[PDB]
Subunit: 216 residues, 5 copies
């Protein structure tokens, strides 16, 4: 019965932490110019599924890793039975509105929408996705291959509210499907800055550039 | 000071969304101006077996409400915020000759500024009625589709444009189809049945195989 | 004025939707007339490998409730308003021979007038059962699909039309298919089991491949 | 008096839905009979590259609950009403060998009668596992799909039919496929693990390409 | 105290009281933790290989995915509730494990009612029927040796110190396999694998579904 109570007790601690973080205190309304947020973005490309030259659409399957850190999600694990992290439904917390800028169909989510929250206040959210986007696969049947590119970024926040960044410019290809119809020649993920004439604030995206060819 | 910034935004939003009778939509005594514009990104597909064409575009919608106005001084110099499109009233702007339900490609979030203006820009994929005959020639094909309120007249939603030129500066350079022109013309009509004006925006695209 | 216009509208909605009972649907003692009409916009596709045809149309539905009545004088001269179709009772009018769920193309919003009348006009894409044999001939193909209430007899929902001619004034001029005729005929059926009449509107379209 | 018929119905629905315990599902001590019947409307598609066939049918389901009975004399002679299927318990009848989620074609509304019986007739399009080999010959193709509760044994839901003949009186006369026969046969099975009987209805359809 | 007062009540009455006590009253289960890990047993019953697309290297499978776990917070004494030993609940009204195909190419399509069976020992049985498109090269399907493909299933967000994924057998149940499928199964195995990463001390668990198949002659 001791072990049963320890288990009951760890649950009570997890619920106390969640109740402290989500119900007792005000939650996150989203970033502002006086409280900007850094979102780190990374791609793990799994498969090029289809390259359609009649419409110039290509379909990719990838994991999109999103990470940010909030003071409001920080806690001392000592105040909560040494809990260092927990899980939560992505709908229960603020998440950044990162979107592909040149999709041709709504993105299809392939993983459960659950985020990992760590005691330093960092949130990790890794939606697995199938995306159709604009791409001319001319060259795919040659040694040089085809090249396509799609930009990801916030829909409604500038770089003074959400600063987007990558930890590396190299797309993780260590999970790329070895028997895909297409082989990857290179895949890069590059933070780009753009300014509009109207406006002094920078606008940021991460450009996913994939060079690929028919596997032979 | 980051604490106070967040506190000010939370206060602004509860003041506007919880402590105030929120906008129930327009009336004939209280008409709303809605300004509409298109940024055409791609002609994805032109199907000659069914005469349907598929477009991807950003549809910019703007309107302004007194109920969404505030003084940035009372709220730590906050001049704008974001809200879910589901949490505010949005206009019922619809394509009149779509052949499939529109597919939304962007997060359904609007930008509200302190002057009460709301900007909502859904990226959409639309299939609509279009005969692509001529697309494989130099002159190209021409198609058209009207957008407007489904249930409000021009005395209720005053639908306007800022320009008759569709923005082509985001158009995909390697589309199967090149754009010869794209216009967005406001049409104000009076039908014999009724005294109210009815307004639509007629999107006309002339295009050909690249 | 504009703060009073909005105040009265919100007050009218409150009085209809929160301070009297909402409509539980028709009964044999309190039957409801529903008037139905079609505006055919396009025959998108005719599939001879499965005998399905796809139409796009606007389906106009009209009914009238004493519980949606008001005196405009008591509400600042407001003579109509709009409501989500989810927030009111609507009639269960269904195609009887569809092959895929109907796809709705228009915002699901209804128009309520002070006389209690409701107007609801969904734009729809429908796939239904149809053999398009003859479509590539001068005589063309002919198909038909019935619409009616799924669960109410004619003693509970009295289905009517205003005309037996489908409105073809919005028909897409450059469709793959040219319309030869489109009619919408009220039909009354009687089953031997049952004294009550069963009503449908039979949409019959004759069409052929354009020239 | 039409305000009184409306009020009587609201009073009936309040008494049944809000002022007594709603039905939580069957139990071993109190099992429920569910009667199932098919009305086959169309074979839309037979796909010999994946061995899937698509059917449109009406699936009639009927059960009876003490908790839904009333005396019509206590409620202005109301003998039946309609309810959204979402607002009452419904049985978990499932095709066991579908290959795509079922697609519902009719409004999800049930008919409740004063004896407590509930009638629910969803129209559905179903893709299921079927080898159409022979469909282009005179003897035709034969396929079968079982239906039953996903989670209740025969000691909890006693599944029955009224007839082993599938109703073909609404079958589309201009389908690509004609029906040679269609039967719905109650089957009882036991598993080594367990004493309870498990019940299904085997829908067996023989069909061929129409001439 | 005796446990006789419940015997006088309708079985439905007792069922509603049981659900009420477990769901409405008990603060429910926040999911597993390192201090309170959960065992989840996973098993597959393969019903059909519907489609093998050599133009995209996607294969479509239909199968029943059996999931079983046991929670203390869902235990009860049948003697307090008219000898009710089990009940059904919407899968949306309880916690369920986040078991995910790792190499799907389309969202899974659910083919059965999302209802779970809860037994008085606290065990939950949940068996969604599913259609899955996943990454698979079917080259060789038109030969005697056939094609081989694999797809791993596991928790998306929990390590092996939080959800221990188990199997009852490494044999995929083929006793419901569609006898007239376009494809015949040569073999089908489900192997629990433990993965260790350079970065991290926690083990990670998946079940690898490996199917060898060919076109039925
Ligand atoms: C909802 C929106 C923008 C949605 C469309 C886009 N969103 C991501 C960011 C903010 C844009 C810079 C890019 C854009 C998506 C991708 C894109 C392209 O690839 O060409 C163009 C998008 C851009 O977005 C607007 C107005 C945007 C440009 C930057 C300055 C500004 C002015 C205020 C501001 O308004 C926007 C949000 C941020 C804010 C408040 O600073 C309003 O941005 O307008 C409008 C589009 C129709 C398109 O023409 C292009 O211009
Ligand atoms: C829900 C509706 C109309 C939905 C269909 C359309 N909506 C947008 C506006 C209001 C119409 C002028 C156009 C219409 C869509 C496009 C269209 C076409 O391209 O041909 C025809 C649409 C029109 O809409 C009605 C009645 C509409 C015409 C204008 C006057 C009026 C009378 C009252 C009013 O009712 C309508 C709303 C506005 C209101 C209250 O002022 C009822 O409009 O009826 C009904 C359709 C079936 C179609 O025949 C055509 O006629
Ligand atoms: C939910 C339902 C019926 C759903 C299916 C249909 N609904 C619309 C009306 C009520 C039917 C006459 C037609 C029917 C749809 C179209 C159709 C066909 O094209 O063949 C057949 C539908 C019919 O509907 C039933 C029982 C219906 C026939 C008329 C008398 C009656 C008996 C009571 C009653 O029950 C029905 C509702 C009305 C009610 C209460 O008066 C039960 O209707 O049963 C059941 C079907 C399986 C089919 O065989 C055919 O018979
Ligand atoms: C959710 C479920 C079963 C879902 C799958 C099926 N459901 C309908 C009924 C109950 C089964 C007899 C058939 C089955 C669907 C069709 C099918 C087939 O055609 O092969 C096999 C289904 C069966 O269902 C299990 C365990 C089922 C068989 C009978 C006894 C029992 C033991 C307890 C019990 O658990 C089940 C519910 C009923 C209950 C509580 O009495 C657990 O059923 O387990 C599990 C499947 C993987 C499959 O192998 C086959 O065996
Ligand atoms: C949401 C996630 C991971 C989602 C992706 C995957 N989830 C299931 C488990 C946890 C992974 C080991 C596998 C992985 C799916 C399958 C897969 C593959 O087949 O290659 C790779 C997935 C993996 O998951 C990450 C970070 C994962 C590796 C193990 C250690 C760690 C660090 C903390 C932790 O973070 C993850 C949850 C568990 C936790 C908190 O312990 C964060 O796991 O990161 C992230 C992916 C982009 C991919 O590169 C690969 O690496
Ligand atoms: Ca007209
Ligand atoms: Ca007892
Ligand atoms: Cl008109």
């Amino acid at each position: 019965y001791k072990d049963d109570d320890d288990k009951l007790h760890s649950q009570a601690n997890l619920m106390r932490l969640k109740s402290d973080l989500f119900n007792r205190s005000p939650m996150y309304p989203g970033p502002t110019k006086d409280d900007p947020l850094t979102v780190t973005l990374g791609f793990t490309l799994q498969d090029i599924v289809k390259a359609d030259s009649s419409t110039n659409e290509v379909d990719l399957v990838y994991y999109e890793q999103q990470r940010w850190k909030l003071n409001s999600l920080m806690w001392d694990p000592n105040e909560y039975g040494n809990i260092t992290d927990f899980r939560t439904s992505a709908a229960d917390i603020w998440t950044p509105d990162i979107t592909a800028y040149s999709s041709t169909r709504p993105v299809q989510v392939l993983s459960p929408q659950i985020a990992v929250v760590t005691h330093d206040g960092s949130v990790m959210f890794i939606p697995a996705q199938r995306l159709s986007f604009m791409c001319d696969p001319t060259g795919v049947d040659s040694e040089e291959g085809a090249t396509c590119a799609v930009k990801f970024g916030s829909w409604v926040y500038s770089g003074f509210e959400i600063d987007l960044k990558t930890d590396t410019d190299q797309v993780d290809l260590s999970s790329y499907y070895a028997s895909s119809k297409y082989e990857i020649l290179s895949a890069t993920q590059t933070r780009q800055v753009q300014h509009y004439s109207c406006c002094p604030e920078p606008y940021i995206d991460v450009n996913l550039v994939v060079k690929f060819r028919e596997r032979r």
